[model samples]
Target: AQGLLLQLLDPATRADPYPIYDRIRRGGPLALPEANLAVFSSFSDCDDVLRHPSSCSDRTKSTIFQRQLAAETQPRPQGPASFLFLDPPDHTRLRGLVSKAFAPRVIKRLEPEITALVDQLLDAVDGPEFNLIDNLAYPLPVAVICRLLGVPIEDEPKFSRASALLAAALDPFLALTGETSDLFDEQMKAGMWLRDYLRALIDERRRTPGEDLMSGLVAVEESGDQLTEDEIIATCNLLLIAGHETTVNLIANAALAMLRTPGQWAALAADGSRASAVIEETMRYDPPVQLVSRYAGDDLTIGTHTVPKGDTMLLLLAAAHRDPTIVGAPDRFDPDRAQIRHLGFGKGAHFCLGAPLARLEATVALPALAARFPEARLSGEPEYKRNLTLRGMSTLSIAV
Candidate 1:
């Protein structure tokens, strides 16, 4: 079913793809010979795979053609992907350094900054009518990340395009199909753009360092050999993309969930504390990282299928979130659901580092939004872009 995985990445499934996921899961797990892929759908299967020590999230360990060579091929140099694609001990070291920045306590400390930022952003929009995404969702993450990373917020317009192009490169289109040709051009352009941009920023940071994470990473690079210059740039890139593309969808999805249900929006408006449950439900209901990839470090069985070593395990977390055995009324969006459970931020050693920050920001932003605009409704039908992994809408209009 390698071809079926290809179809799964098709842009057509960008919107409302639960039906397709349902079909794939119902068809049973796919263990494809050609692609060396083993697909998992059920919650238990996916959870088992992630928690297993033998399953690595690093793409290089996986026998995807990009990193793997032919039997006769010689060793060559390799470039860096972010911590997301790395396994220990490098992953452990690098991630551990930055872990404190996003720890729950650190996030709580930033609440006042976040609240003020949200208020300032919301105040900018002439309310009663606003593009909620542009006015609130997009800017919030962008600003927060910029502050954290020491990148000039003024330079956002320059890297915004590069960040988006780089984000699309995260898709598994090449592996899903044999055609490595498509989107290659776009990927190269984005890589060059971001690398160059980061290099220039690096020079500036070296001269006039600040308190931001970027400058701090540069200090590590200069002082010792903790991380290389390029690695620093890559970390910045990962954080930028993670910040730019993710939380907007959480806010948007939460808005959609509430607006579609009676008394939900009003309920959140009445009690801003409801934001916790609302955001949790949103994560379970419609996650930002709809899917993720894992590498089979050794031959292992998920359910009855023993996937071969080096096979790329594609777990459909979106489908897993809806598994009846895990979450009750899996199809329904109920903020009041007693046990809110989802691997939306993922599990295992590589759980998303930015999750705490995203959750805190959304908790502050969405509830404030719903409260200020109690009568908000969809101003227009949403138009989604062609992103399978970091999937979200281009615009989500709201009538406040």
Candidate 2:
């Protein structure tokens, strides 16, 4: 487990883990002898683990998470993760309170706003050269999520850093390498700082309720203490991060994918129906949550591998997407695949809460982008941020 095994778990691979993932998958699920870890790359195995009943999400369940949590002096998440990280009664209780507002019906009503935002953003790409991240990818998700959470669009700068830090928290350091990387300490501090900042905002909302999610959480909090203020803050914090972090990648990745394939961009521009396929393919090729983790609650045998309890199961979703078993000649980026399902967003309970919003944002943005700028093309090599799980571009320059 000292050669490629060590490299697979490295944060450096986060930028592009496909090669290492390919190697690990060929070896079967690596039953990491050194740290009692099992890394899963096969689609069915990773899918099965996520949908399993006994499988849990709490970090305390894994020796790896427990070690890191104990070692981390950083402030705890105001509460547990949003539904994206919890299970059962707690996950149900928390998710239920806000589910209605984000139901298909509610999200459907958001279509007009989403379209307006996309059209407005793309219309701004007047020049042949522009950074896609700033002009399109970045603003779409941020604007939509801010409006949904009822946060003033003007105040995004205040919590954007917090969102970045909290999202940075999603990477599986201990599970990946059997040790915590101190590289993210600054981001961790930023996460705690955002929680404190949200606490103040929550206090103001509580005193004078508004027509936003913050006020709604307060109302729920005071209704016989069914939810606490701290819990509300935590929940808001999770939504903020979840909302802020995830969607942009889908947009930028789709743009990059289309740019790579010749007719794909014009095809999308010709028809809006092509948006879904484009977005789905982007998730498979270059996803937001590149790697995901689960705690093996029992000594479960997946394929030829038997992973013991307390050992963490790291799913190389980014790598799994490229797996040949699932897609024909996966290394080739083709949007017109016969089937387009990938675990880019985890498959089950933790399957991203904001996916509907993500889909909607990309749906509106991608086509508008292709239609708005028929001449748009890559200006230079895309620049990447150093994050492992939430890997994305710092700047993707394009000729508009």
Candidate 3:
């Protein structure tokens, strides 16, 4: 069981991790007392854990973290944990402060702008072929997020490396194998640099407010003790990375799936109404986030497995999507399924806040790309990033 978990961390599995995930799921829930961890992969088990009252998002509540703290081996980083990793009052309050910006009503207003941006990107493609990721998927979301966060687009090149490194830090290398790689130091440096950059930007937003999320946060901070400076930086950090990274994968994965499956692309090209179904199917077939972790707040039971308090409960969402028990023909990428079921955006309180924005971007970009280049086809095999948790394509070439 441990060997199977370690296989997931190997870079070789990045291209197609579903095989290992399937094996893990078939093996059923695994408990490693020595590592103080529990692995859940089946659809029902994952769903149950997500909805479990005692399942916590805070990592500090885990036994491993406690032991590390007790042994004085934990590396303390600056700033408060991102609300994505927090629980209860803090998560509710902090998430509430920024949720309005992502509300469906607010995001709906950006359709025209998103459409224009997608068209602008499509117009920039001038050749028989282009890299979908570089030309479309990557730029679209990054631009939208930067504009919303009040971060200048000019500084994107400066912080992209930092963001990529920080995103990779979400991988569960230490949790599964109890080891850190050479990339750990680089990731640490990137994390520090990003926080510092955001701090400087926060200072600027403070002096001159703008119609951006960062400015809103700054205003809230000045108004009272509702949030502090560090929280502001952390919030921006989470939104920035989550905004660009996951959506990039969503767009690229959807495109790849359509290209691989017969007539799927041309169908959407002919009729735009199929865009939502395609996007939803892509999320289930090839999710942007492969897995997520929760610390057991107390002795919690999901199905036959009982996870001890403070243990890390790892949910392999990518595996659960293909559970035959949930959906018939689980391996097939059929967008027209009777009903698509997936926890791709997660479940419960921590459901992805950027989901509306991501869907909107993909919804606009996919149909437009398909309509413009109706004959587009895969030009080369997709190349994936090294990130395990937020796994995605780095490049996907297409011939027009």
Candidate 4:
């Protein structure tokens, strides 16, 4: 079991971590008291934990965090934690502030623009072979997010490296092995750099407001004592990183799945309506945000296991999505599955705020790519990034 856990941390497993996930799932809930960690991989367990009242998103509440605080070894970078990592009142208030931008109705209105963007990207494909990540997957989401947030698209080259570094920091090195990764200093610097960058942008938005979300947030801050500079920076940081990370994987993963599975690509290309099912199945089979962590705010009982208060609860969502009890032929990537249920966007309060936007991006991009390049085929093997949590491809070469 320990070896399996270590294998999960290994970069070599990045391309295909599902086999390790399956092995860990079969072993059931793994309790490591010494690490103050409890790992749940079953569908029921992961679902229960996500929706559990006692399950907390705040890591500061964990026993390990308390230990770090006691030992003065806490190395968290500056700025307030993102709303995704906050519990109620704070979580409720912060999420409420940003929720309007991501509301389904608001997101739906972006369909035309997203479609145009996808068309524009595909138009520039220029050759028989092109990298999907570079051409479409990466740029599409980044542009939308920048437009929505009022960030200058030209500045993407400056902060993209920061976003990738910060996303990689989501990997749970300390909780699993009681040691930080060798890149800890670099990740910390990236976090600080992003927050400082957002702070400078907030000042710009303050001088001359725009219709974008960042300007909206600045207005909210000036109107009352409801928001702080740190909170605004944190929120932008969260959305920016999320904007760059998750959706790219969704687009790339779905495309890869169809390319690998016989007829799947042609089937989608033949009919556009199949996009939703393909996206949903891709979320289940190969999720973007693979696993999420929560702390036992109180002694939490999940199934037959009771996690002590302050212990870390690691929910292997990627593993649980493949649970046999939940779906028929869990291993197969069949979009035709009668019911495609998954914690891909999570459950309850901390459910992904960007889900609707992500779905819309893929919904627009995938079908368009298939329809344009109907004869598209894999040009070469895909190369994956080293990130464990936001696992995704660095490049996917395809020939049209």
Candidate 5:
């Protein structure tokens, strides 16, 4: 089990970690009693853990985190933790404050702007060969998120590295690869810097507000009761990273999936309506968030497995999406499948708050690209980023 865990963490497997997931699934949900950890890969197990009331998103509940805090080996997370990592009252309050902006109606209002942005992006594609990532996938989401959060688009070049570093922090370093990453210090520094940057942005907004989420948060703070400055910073940081990382992968993964599967790309190209199906399948087949980590708030029984209180659980959502029992031809990318179900955006209380925005962005961006470049094909091998949890390509060249 130790050797297998190592393989799963091996950087060499980052480009394609499905085989390792298969091995882990075959072994069933693993129990490392000594480590106080349980890892679930099968669909039922992962889904069960996600929907379980006792399944916690907070790392502080994990024994490893407590031990780290006790040993002072790993410094505690600075500033207010993201609501994504909070539970109950904290999660409820924080999520409530920002949920309105991402509500379906609010997102729907941005459709024209999103479509315009997509049009501008596609207009930039020049010649026969172009980098899909550099030209479209990465920039579109960053631009939209910056606009939504009222951040300066021109300043993205400054915080882009910080966003990447913070996203990589989602990987299982201590749990899967062993001790804290040698890069842990750098990750911490990135977090602190971003938090400070957001704090400054909040102050700026307070003095001269704008029509953006950040400003709205400032208004809420001024209302005498609600979120504090630190909470606002934490919320922005979460939204920024979530908005920055998730959709890029969704778009890139969809394009890659279509290119890999026969007739899919051209099929979507011929019919713009196929975008939703393509996005759904891309999410299930290769989710932007490959896995999610949780801690057991109480003794939890998942399928035939039992995880004790304070035990850490790793839910392999990408693997579960391929469970044959759940979906036929689990390995295949068939968006047209009559029924498609996935825990891609998660379930229960901690479900991704940015899901609606992500879905809106992908549905608008993908089909437009395919329809505009019906003959587009992969021009080079896709390059994977060194991230495990938010796995995605750093480069995907396309020939139009």
Candidate 6:
């Protein structure tokens, strides 16, 4: 099981992890009862896990966490867990407070600004050849998220590396193999640094509130028993890291995929409406978030595999995206591909709250780039970043 997990983590296969995902799926759902780990790759099993009532997103329910608790030793670098790692009333409460801000209606209001941002990015593009990751993909989400959260966009470059490191920490190290990687210490430091950074900015927000989510959260905390300073810090931290990480990959991945497939780029160039299909297909074909981890709140059965309570559930989202049973010709990158069943933004209680915003950015950016540079083609192979969870390219040069 450890060997298999290592293979999935292996950087050599990062460029194309699909074949390995197929390798894991062949053995049915990989179950390590003693380790209390159950990994699912098939579309159905993955879907079942996400929708399962007994499934819990909180890692504190996992055997490793239980073991740590039983030992009565403080876990290293402990702090408030993100709502993404919480379940039940806590999850319901936090999500409720923030949902209105990210509601489709609110996000739609930003479409004009988003469109303008895309235009500005294209206007500044160095023309004939440029790296999409830097010029467009990375900046768009950072800009949108910063404006939403009321963070200083100029500080993005300062904390961007920390954001990257924290995203890598989402990989299932203890869950997959009952061990921590050498990067664990580094992850801890990154997490602490980010929390401290958010804490300082949150203090500033408290001193003089602004028209931003963080300021709103601070207001909520100050007004009543609804929220806490720590929780606000945690929420801001989650939004910051998530905001900095995921959408960039979605934009770049879609761009790379369209450029690789014949006529796809030209087709989108000719018709702006093709953006939705292209973005959705890129999500199915190469999702930004490759996997998600959960804890078994109770014994659960998914397909032929049974997961015991307290065990961890690792869903290979990238693998599930390509499941032949759910998607026909799963290997091909076709925006027009039928039945685009995917957990790209996840599902159930933990579905990505930022989905609308992410979709908006990609929908706006991809079509604009295509229409502006209809002859866009890959200048060279994309270089994958050393991240397993928020897996994406560090660079992708395109000839326009």
lDDT of each: 0.80, 0.75, 0.87, 0.89, 0.85, 0.84
Ten-residue stretch with the least lDDT total in model 5? 78-87
Residue by residue across 98-128, what tens digits does model 2's lDDT show?
Answer: 7776776778888998888877887677685
lDDT of 3: 0.87
Residue-level lDDT tens digits of model 1 in 259-328:
8888999999899999999998888888888888888788888878888888888889888888877777
TM-score of 3: 0.96
TM-score of 6: 0.94
lDDT of 5: 0.85
The C-alpha TM-scores of every prediction are: 0.92, 0.90, 0.96, 0.96, 0.96, 0.94
Off by over 4 Å in 6: 68-75, 81-87
Candidate 4, superposed: residue stretches over 4 Å from native: 70-77, 81-87
lDDT of 5 by residue, 1-400 (tens): 8778788778788878888888888887789868887888998888788888898877778898777667764445667542235448977998887788888888899889999999999998896898888988998889889998999977798678778888998888877655777777787777888888888889899899999999999999988667788778888888888877889999999999999998999999899899888888999988999999888998879987789999889989988988888898888889899656689999877788788889899999999998899888898888998888999999999987
- Per-candidate RMSD vs. true structure? 2.8, 2.8, 1.8, 1.7, 1.8, 2.1
In each prediction, how many residue pairs overlap at the backbone (N, C-alpha, C within less than 3 A)?
0, 1, 0, 0, 0, 0
Best by lDDT: 4
Compare candidates 2 and 3 on TM-score and give the better one. Answer: 3
Kindly provide the TM-score of model 2 when superposed on the true structure, using C-alpha atoms: 0.90
Per-residue lDDT of candidate 3, residues 54-160 (tens digit): 98888678887676556655565775432235449878998898888889899999999898999999999977889999999999999988889878888898668
Q: Model 3, stretches more than 4 Å misplaced?
A: 69-75, 81-87
lDDT value, residue 281 of candidate 5? 90
lDDT of 1 at 339: 56
